[PDB]
Amino acid sequence: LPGEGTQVHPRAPLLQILKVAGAQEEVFTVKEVMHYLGQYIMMKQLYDKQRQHIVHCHDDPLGELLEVGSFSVKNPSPLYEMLKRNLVIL
């Protein structure tokens, strides 16, 4: 995963999720990708209402990319693995 300055281009399935969250560009930093992923999860209320570090991704397009039904914001490895599969480094 590249640093705070390196630019990335998301593959089409990930870009569609970012665009739902309001992204207007096609090139990002990793921290911008994470911003829009957070926006997406928040807008769609995928986080568990009571234990809000748990994200329930099943039956959502995000879960199809993550390949897991749920994950913890404190165990972000599935998210990082998804980003490695879905970001082209520029």
């Binding site: 994470m34 957070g38 809000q52 570090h53 994200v55 914001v73």
Partner: peptide, 14 residues
């Protein structure tokens, strides 16, 4: 009692 927005921001900014 931490909100998702605060938890994700911590992840994002680290």
């Amino acid at each position: 009692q931490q909100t998702f927005x605060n938890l994700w921001r911590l992840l994002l900014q680290n």
